[PDB]
Amino acid sequence: ALNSINTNAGAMIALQNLNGTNSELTTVQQRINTGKKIASAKDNGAIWATAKNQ
Amino acid sequence: ALNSINTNAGAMIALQNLNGTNSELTTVQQRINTGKKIASAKDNGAIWATAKNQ
Numbered sequence: 624a625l626n627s628i629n630t631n632a633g634a635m636i637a638l639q640n641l642n643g644t645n646s647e648l649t650t651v652q653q654r655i656n657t658g659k660k661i662a663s664a665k666d667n668g669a670i671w672a673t674a675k676n677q
Numbered sequence: 678a679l680n681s682i683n684t685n686a687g688a689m690i691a692l693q694n695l696n697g698t699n700s701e702l703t704t705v706q707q708r709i710n711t712g713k714k715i716a717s718a719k720d721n722g723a724i725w726a727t728a729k730n731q
Contacts, residue, residue, distance in 0.1 A: 627712070628712045629712055629713065
């Protein structure tokens with residue numbers, strides 16, 4: 624209602640965007656730590672399985 | 678009879694208007710206290726029920 628005292632969507636949307644940025648940061652940090660894109664089975668199942676067997 | 682000693686309608690009508698103002702004041706104060714228009718089931722049955730279930 625532009626003056627509500629119980630809720631505000633601006634904080635919710637700011638939180639959502641911050642969480643998205645944190646997730647991307649986590650992915651990049653994992654890449655830097657392990658030194659490779661496909662490190663686990665979550666990154667890419669097909670390529671990870673192929674590399675293990677090879 | 679413009680000079681009656683038993684009754685006067687001016688006081689009655691002044692009382693009625695004062696009571697109406699008091700009722701409106703009560704409604705506004707309730708809105709300020711709870712911070713919302715539809716707070717109870719008396720304000721609006723349909724919207725209150727919808728909000729509860731949602």
